[PDB]
């Protein structure tokens, strides 16, 4: 059948191997005290190519193949994604939901490849085992009991319950607690991840859960690499999408329109613009959160449409990085060449 790969890395599995090979070698594994972190690959960003340049029947062939139409529809339908008309569109790439989707999602955002070799999944577990997690454990216990400014047990036990969280970060398999190859990761894991990458992660999650039955995992929000100074970190975010219980990358589109590369730092709430939740902040930081954002992100103000009445409000948005992957490690180009060719062969074919 119409052989147009389901993922961008299939267009050239050899190149994909090159990427997956350079990755672990780019990991700084300081056995001194600081967390394991990447030296340069975390600065990479990929963008999807424009398909609005192809015939409709064909444009759909592509979208059906690479995009997670389910999460796309869901997050867009609740105006949680691409609701802003002044910024570029973000697209959700399919990602394996084998319990390591957070790593596959993150890995795809910057590299085009998934965490097939469990390098990122391994970096996380290594950090939580061979590094000082005193500050992580702290921020974890804090937001657990809940202690912030933009959100809303028994008798002594915060070392074993934490212990487990470290087990989930492992490559071990659950006893089909839900039926996946790896254990599911939560908030704290995302936070440690953005520190290992020294790059902020912003998760766009589904709120539509009037039918939820969790007695909930509030993943949506901003994860800043607070264990590092904004100077030693990358000021461009990694945008992820999140629905029932699955992560997907929300990569920006490559060309069309004069709109800017930016991701609004607010939600198109019910009539109001609510600020996005910034995870694991301390009482102090929480006070200066708008400062930290301007520091760890490249914050800009954008005049967005008001609430359907000639009014316009000024909102905060983080600038999104532009595709910077060198050709020798750029899978979007190869996949593009595939579609370019099957297309010329689609025009000559549609002569029937």
Closest alpha carbon to 36 in 130, 114, 102:
130
101 is catalytic: yes
- Is beta strand 221-223 parallel, antiparallel or unpaired with respect to 238-242? unpaired
Q: Which two tokens stand for residue 247?
A: 């992560």
Residue linked to tokens 């600081």:
34
Backbone CA torsion sign across 345, 348, 351, 352:
negative
The total of structural domains in the chain comes to 1
Are residues 99 and 180 in contact, defined by beta-carbon separation less than 8 angstroms?
yes
Range of the domain at 267: 1-352
Q: What burial class does residue 178 get, using C-beta atoms within 10 Å of its C-beta: 0-12 exposed, 13-18 middle, 19+ buried?
A: exposed
Interatomic CA distance for residues 345 and 50, integer angstroms: 19
Per-residue exposure over 258-282, b if at least 16 CB sit within 10 Å of its own CB, e if not: eeebbbbbbbbeeeebebbbbbbbe
Q: Which helix (H) or strand (E) holds 202?
A: strand 201-205
Resolution of this entry, Å = 2.5
> Would you say the C-alpha torsion 261, 55, 69, 189 has a positive or negative sign?
negative
Q: Which residue is catalytic, options 36, 42, 101, 279?
A: 101
243 a catalytic residue: no
Q: How far apart are CA 200 and CA 223, in angstroms?
A: 5
Task: Name the catalytic one among 246, 279, 321, 334.
Answer: 246
């Amino acid at each position: 059948e119409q052989v147009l790969p389901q993922a961008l890395y299939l267009s050239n599995m050899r190149k994909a191997v090159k990427i997956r090979e350079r990755t672990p070698e780019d990991i700084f594994k300081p056995t001194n005290g600081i967390i394991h972190h990447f030296k340069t690959m975390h600065r990479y960003t990929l963008e999807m190519f424009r398909t609005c340049q192809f015939c409709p029947q064909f444009r759909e062939i592509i979208h059906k193949a690479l995009i997670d139409r389910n999460i796309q529809a869901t997050l867009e339908s609740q105006k949680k994604l691409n609701w802003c008309r002044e910024v570029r569109k973000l697209v959700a790439l399919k990602t394996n939901g084998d319990g390591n989707c957070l790593m596959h999602a993150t890995s795809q955002y910057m590299w085009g490849v998934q965490d097939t070799d469990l390098v990122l999944r391994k970096a996380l577990f290594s950090t939580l085992k061979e590094t000082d997690t005193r500050n992580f454990k702290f921020r974890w216990q804090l937001e657990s009991l809940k202690s912030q400014e933009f959100v809303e047990y028994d008798t002594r036990n915060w070392n074993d319950e934490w212990d487990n969280l470290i087990k989930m970060a492992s490559t071990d398999t659950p006893m089909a607690r839900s039926g996946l190859q790896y254990n599911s990761l939560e908030e704290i894991h995302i936070f440690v991840l953005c520190n290992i990458l020294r790059r902020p992660i912003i998760v766009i999650s589904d709120k539509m859960l009037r039918s939820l039955e969790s007695g909930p995992l509030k993943v949506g929000g901003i994860y800043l690499p607070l264990h590092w100074p904004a100077q030693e970190c990358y000021r461009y975010p990694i945008v992820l999408g999140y629905d029932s219980h699955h992560f997907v990358p929300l990569v920006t589109l490559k060309d069309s329109g004069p709109e800017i590369r930016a991701v609004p730092l607010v939600n198109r709430d019910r009539g109001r613009f609510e600020d996005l939740k910034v995870h694991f902040l301390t009482d102090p930081e929480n006070e200066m959160k708008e400062k930290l954002l301007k520091e760890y992100l490249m914050v800009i103000e954008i005049p967005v449409q008001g609430w359907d009445h000639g009014t316009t409000h000024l909102i905060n948005a983080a600038k999104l990085d532009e595709a910077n992957l060198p050709k020798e490690i750029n899978l979007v180009d190869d996949y593009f060449e595939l579609v370019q060719h099957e297309y010329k062969k689609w025009q000559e074919n549609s002569e029937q």
